[PDB]
Amino acid sequence: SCGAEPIHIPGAIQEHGALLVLSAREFSVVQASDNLANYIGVDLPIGAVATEANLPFISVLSAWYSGEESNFRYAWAEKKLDVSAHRSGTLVILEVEKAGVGESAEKLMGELTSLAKYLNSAPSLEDALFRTAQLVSSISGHDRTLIYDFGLDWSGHVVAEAGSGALPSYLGLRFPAGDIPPQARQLYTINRLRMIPDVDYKPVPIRPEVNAETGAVLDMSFSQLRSVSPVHLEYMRNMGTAASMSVSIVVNGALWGLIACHHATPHSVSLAVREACDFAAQLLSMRIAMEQSSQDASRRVELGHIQARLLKGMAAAEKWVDGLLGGEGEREDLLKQVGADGAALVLGDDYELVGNTPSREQVEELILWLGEREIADVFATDNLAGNYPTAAAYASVASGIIAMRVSEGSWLIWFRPEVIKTVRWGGDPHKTVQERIHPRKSFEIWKEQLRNTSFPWSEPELAAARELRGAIIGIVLRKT
Amino acid sequence: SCGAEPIHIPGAIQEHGALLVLSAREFSVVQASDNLANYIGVDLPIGAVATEANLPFISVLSAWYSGEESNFRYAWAEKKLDVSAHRSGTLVILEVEKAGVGESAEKLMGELTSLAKYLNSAPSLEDALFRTAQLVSSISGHDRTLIYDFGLDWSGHVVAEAGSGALPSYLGLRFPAGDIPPQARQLYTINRLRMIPDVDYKPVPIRPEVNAETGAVLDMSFSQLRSVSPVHLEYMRNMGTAASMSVSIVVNGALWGLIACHHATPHSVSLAVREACDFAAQLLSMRIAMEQSSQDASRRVELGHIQARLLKGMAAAEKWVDGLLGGEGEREDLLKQVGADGAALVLGDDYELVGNTPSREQVEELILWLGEREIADVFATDNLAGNYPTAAAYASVASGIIAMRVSEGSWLIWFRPEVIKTVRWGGDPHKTVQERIHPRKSFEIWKEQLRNTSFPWSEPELAAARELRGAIIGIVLRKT
Numbered sequence: 001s002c003g004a005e006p007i008h009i010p011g012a013i014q015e016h017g018a019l020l021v022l023s024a025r026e027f028s029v030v031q032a033s034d035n036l037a038n039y040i041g042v043d044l045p046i047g048a049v050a051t052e053a054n055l056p057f058i059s060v061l062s063a064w065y066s067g068e069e070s071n072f073r074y075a076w077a078e079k080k081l082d083v084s085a086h087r088s089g090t091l092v093i094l095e096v097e098k099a100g101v102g103e104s105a106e107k108l109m110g111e112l113t114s115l116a117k118y119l120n121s122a123p124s125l126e127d128a129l130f131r132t133a134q135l136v137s138s139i140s141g142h143d144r145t146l147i148y149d150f151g152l153d154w155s156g157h158v159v160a161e162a163g164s165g166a167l168p169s170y171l172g173l174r175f176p177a178g179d180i181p182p183q184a185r186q187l188y189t190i191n192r193l194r195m196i197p198d199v200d201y202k203p204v205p206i207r208p209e210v211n212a213e214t215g216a217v218l219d220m221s222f223s224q225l226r227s228v229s230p231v232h233l234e235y236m237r238n239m240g241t242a243a244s245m246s247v248s249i250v251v252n253g254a255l256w257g258l259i260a261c262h263h264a265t266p267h268s269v270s271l272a273v274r275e276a277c278d279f280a281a282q283l284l285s286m287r288i289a290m291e292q293s294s295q296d297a298s299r300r301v302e303l304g305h306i307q308a309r310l311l312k313g314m315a316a317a318e319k320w321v322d323g324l325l326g327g328e329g330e331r332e333d334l335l336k337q338v339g340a341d342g343a344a345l346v347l348g349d350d351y352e353l354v355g356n357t358p359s360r361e362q363v364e365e366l367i368l369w370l371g372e373r374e375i376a377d378v379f380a381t382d383n384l385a386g387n388y389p390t391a392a393a394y395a396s397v398a399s400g401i402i403a404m405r406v407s408e409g410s411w412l413i414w415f416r417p418e419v420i421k422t423v424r425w426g427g428d429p430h431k432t433v434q435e436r437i438h439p440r441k442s443f444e445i446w447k448e449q450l451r452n453t454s455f456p457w458s459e460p461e462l463a464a465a466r467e468l469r470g471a472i473i474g475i476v477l478r479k480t
Numbered sequence: 481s482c483g484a485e486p487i488h489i490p491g492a493i494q495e496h497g498a499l500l501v502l503s504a505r506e507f508s509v510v511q512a513s514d515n516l517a518n519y520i521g522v523d524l525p526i527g528a529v530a531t532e533a534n535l536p537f538i539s540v541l542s543a544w545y546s547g548e549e550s551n552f553r554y555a556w557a558e559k560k561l562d563v564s565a566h567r568s569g570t571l572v573i574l575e576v577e578k579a580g581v582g583e584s585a586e587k588l589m590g591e592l593t594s595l596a597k598y599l600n601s602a603p604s605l606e607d608a609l610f611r612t613a614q615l616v617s618s619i620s621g622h623d624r625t626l627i628y629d630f631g632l633d634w635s636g637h638v639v640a641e642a643g644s645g646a647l648p649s650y651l652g653l654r655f656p657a658g659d660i661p662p663q664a665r666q667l668y669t670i671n672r673l674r675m676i677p678d679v680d681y682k683p684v685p686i687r688p689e690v691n692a693e694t695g696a697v698l699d700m701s702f703s704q705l706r707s708v709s710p711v712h713l714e715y716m717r718n719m720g721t722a723a724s725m726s727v728s729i730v731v732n733g734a735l736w737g738l739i740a741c742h743h744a745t746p747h748s749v750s751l752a753v754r755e756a757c758d759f760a761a762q763l764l765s766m767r768i769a770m771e772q773s774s775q776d777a778s779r780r781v782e783l784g785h786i787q788a789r790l791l792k793g794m795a796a797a798e799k800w801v802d803g804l805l806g807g808e809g810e811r812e813d814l815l816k817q818v819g820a821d822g823a824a825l826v827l828g829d830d831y832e833l834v835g836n837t838p839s840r841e842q843v844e845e846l847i848l849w850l851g852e853r854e855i856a857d858v859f860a861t862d863n864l865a866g867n868y869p870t871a872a873a874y875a876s877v878a879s880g881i882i883a884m885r886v887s888e889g890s891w892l893i894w895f896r897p898e899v900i901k902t903v904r905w906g907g908d909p910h911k912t913v914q915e916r917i918h919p920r921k922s923f924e925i926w927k928e929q930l931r932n933t934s935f936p937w938s939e940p941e942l943a944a945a946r947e948l949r950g951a952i953i954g955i956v957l958r959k960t
């Protein structure tokens with residue numbers, strides 16, 4: 001039920017601006033928000049063509065519409081409004097918000113450069129995330145700005161925070177995946193910005209609900225004024241945030257994380273400042289992606305050093321196994337190939353244990369257990385006792401493993417020990433008030449000792465595992 | 481209820497191919513269709529990395545993935561399969577279908593050119609639509625190929641047909657809008673091709689239903705194997721079509737119409753031929769768009785001739801009204817300005833009727849009726865008796881009108897007479913079996929005399945109306 005609410009078609013906006021939908025062919029009015037007259041100062045009925053008398057920007061909007069610039073922005077000094085628009089099929093969606101008076105563009109510009117200089121010097125990611133949080137905190141004026149990093153399961157945890165003391169500190173807390181369900185996360189991957197200036201706004205309808213040009217209700221995916229999900233607003237109330245504002249951090253086409261801003265009372269942010277925060281997220285995205293590519297490449301080539309050095313040792317060795325484990329350096333490398341603390345090479349009934357392993361009998365019983373599983377190439381887990389409760393007995397030495405079959409009945413398995421982590425959750429991760437699934441009322445810190453879990457296997461490490469398997473597969477077939 | 485079924489996320493495919501979803505980072509298997517083993521000849525469990533041993537194309541797919549070509553196609557001669565793929569966020573969606581043996585590429589090429597030569601010579605649209613239907617009929621082998629033109633209300637009517645006698649002829653029939661509801665039409669605007677080789681296929685699931693990479697169910701919007709809506713399949717059964725295939729005709733970013741193919745028994749079409757039919761639709765789209773731009777421009781400049789000639793006549797005239805109506809030629813032009821058969825100029829209580837109008841009293845009572853309506857610029861209708869039953873009394877002379885206010889209490893109204901059209905519908909347009917809305921069982925021709933309706937006003941004509949209003953607005957303000 002959770003991810004099925006279509007958040008992109010509510011047929012309504014928030015109060016802090018108004019909305020006009022017009023037909024590209026002729027710029028005739030097709031839909032409007034009920035509050036449009038309160039901003040524009042002219043009705044514009046359905047069917048009405050836009051003219052320079054009522055929309056002074058109409059001349060530049062036509063120009064914008066033919067061009068390539070995906071969005072339109074225009075300062076309407078007359079009415080102190082910021083106007084913006086975008087294309088949606090054959091429609092232009094105009095949004096009008098009150099202009100943010102008393103803000104400086106040199107302020108933004110100067111502040112943005114202080115981050116861009118910082119970000120381009122190759123600094124530690126932690127400090128990049130903090131000062132990015134702290135600029136958005138500076139220029140936005142919220143009570144809390146934080147940076148929320150998604151994990152592989154789409155739970156996320158707070159990795160940076162700036163604030164004014166007025167709201168709680170969530171630095172280092174994990175939050176469960178359902179807090180930002182999948183349709184929200186997909187929307188946020190393509191529309192990278194959102195603002196909710198007042199949690200208790202009364203939704204302002206868009207009439208007619210069905211657009212007469214398309215036959216459908218309006219796709220509000222790129223509407224910055226879109227009315228948000230009712231259930232999320234209970235989340236905000238439950239949290240005690242009267243205003244929020246968030247910006248997607250998109251790295252390599254994927255939603256990496258969020259800059260999340262919250263205020264204790266209501267709060268608004270100008271179109272300009274919101275455009276500035278998107279800029280900040282964009283720079284940080286570039287930092288993150290390069291930090292990843294460089295850490296990966298340097299790890300891949302470091303594993304390459306080890307890989308070939310074992311590859312030549314096995315080839316040059318008489319019995320071959322002695323390339324993997326002939327003396328100090330070969331064993332050392334076998335464990336460093338995949339960043340392991342021990343390993344078991346099993347050639348039928350000949351067991352060889354290197355480094356810190358479980359017992360010969362424990363490994364026997366693991367292999368039997370593995371044999372029943374259907375594994376294509378390699379089996380990796382950071383939590384062996386999840387799928388094999390039995391292995392809770394040797395969690396200190398083999399919480400995580402990579403296992404590689406070799407014959408039909410040999411095996412090569414690496415071991416990683418338990419790392420004890422205390423994870424702090426923003427409220428109980430499992431709790432939801434069932435009825436429609438409603439949000440939990442408490443975000444008090446909820447502790448959880450994490451047991452039987454190793455450091456996770458990096459993708460270079462699994463790649464080296466699969467690589468090393470091939471060389472071994474090709475030698476036992478050759479030897480026989 | 482009708483347009484809310486999310487047709488793009490059924491978690492299942494049709495039987496005529498299989499599907500594999502893999503993760504772009506590593507090409508690891510994330511989802512598969514239950515029939516994948518029946519096509520690939522290797523299981524590939526969830527977590528399995530793709531290698532050259534099981535997917536020979538993996539080398540070229542990696543190459544494709546980095547590049548700009550939005551789709552991937554590859555001939556897998558070994559297994560007689562056509563493989564294709566596309567990008568979906570951070571995922572590659574591979575689809576495998578049996579290759580169409582016994583077809584010629586020179587056949588397609590030669591046939592496609594015979595349309596392209598035809599289409600580039602500026603022929604009448606009717607003949608372009610027919611021979612486009614007839615090529616798709618030729619190369620696809622269905623029992624009926626037709627071209628379906630959407631109207632402004634998203635009902636559509638058949639404007640070309642080629643066939644083998646084995647199915648009914650629908651040439652000239654209208655079909656109601658709900659036959660292709662809005663979410664289907666929006667999907668077809670971006671995914672321009674679809675094939676349903678057998679109406680009674682048993683859906684083949686995609687497991688796991690929730691993708692572990694994204695956290696969401698698979699967005700199958702660009703999946704050529706996607707399982708179609710159950711309700712549409714009742715439509716096909718009700719119609720007596722065992723196979724179908726359709727191609728969007730997209731002009732200026734909008735769904736203009738469909739090439740719709742249907743077979744009496746099951747039928748399939750190769751990836752190549754389907755790519756060929758999309759090509760044909762693409763050429764025809766270009767024809768249509770140029771036919772429109774040229775008919776419009778030539779009509780706009782023809783209305784310009786009249787516009788300025790009246791504009792100079794009004795300026796040069798002493799009482800001004802005599803520019804609109806001083807002698808033969810001025811009246812002639814007043815009616816030709818907007819392609820009308822009569823008009824009423826009303827300056828307070830001074831009524832002037834030109835050409836074929838309703839009675840002075842009828843026009844009085846229309847103006848009073850108009851005054852109560854809230855009109856920004858001009859009011860146009862092709863069906864005056866719809867909103868003003870009273871006007872059914874003078875439908876022969878004023879079924880359609882454009883009315884333009886001028887003072888506060890003058891008016892300029894044009895009139896168009898009733899055109900009697902017998903419209904043929906493919907079954908009763910209003911009928912749907914309520915329960916979930918199910919499709920009607922009869923597509924027998926359903927006749928409807930269309931009364932009280934004029935030839936519709938073209939957008940150049942309304943533009944000239946609004947234009948002529950401005951000149952008149954600016955003169956009565958000047959005269960006073």
Ligand SMILES: */C=C/C1=C(C)C(=O)N/C1=C\C1=NC(=C\c2[nH]c(/C=C3\NC(=O)C(C=C)=C3C)c(C)c2CCC(=O)O)/C(CCC(=O)O)=C1C
Binds near residue numbers: 180228246439
């Ligand atoms: C299944 C319904 C939902 C439950 C239960 C739930 O807890 N959230 C549910 C739905 C939605 N959440 C949406 C937006 C959203 N959620 C968050 C979450 C956080 N805010 C925080 O401060 C923290 C922790 C630091 C988290 C994890 C955010 C940031 C957002 C985005 C909006 C914002 O900036 O506040 C959401 C979508 C709303 C919409 O866009 O309409 C839904 C449906």
Ligand SMILES: */C=C/C1=C(C)C(=O)N/C1=C\C1=NC(=C\c2[nH]c(/C=C3\NC(=O)C(C=C)=C3C)c(C)c2CCC(=O)O)/C(CCC(=O)O)=C1C
Binds near residue numbers: 655676709726
């Ligand atoms: C509200 C549910 C629907 C009713 C009622 C209904 O009549 N159709 C309903 C839904 C869908 N129709 C879908 C596809 C579709 N419909 C047509 C219609 C025609 N086929 C014809 O031969 C003619 C007339 C000449 C018409 C008007 C077409 C062409 C299609 C496209 C598929 C095809 O090529 O047959 C549809 C979508 C199915 C999907 O893509 O999953 C729905 C949901």
Ligand SMILES: [Ca+2]
Binds near residue numbers: 149256
């Ligand atoms: Ca992460």
Ligand SMILES: [Ca+2]
Binds near residue numbers: 629630631632736
């Ligand atoms: Ca049309």
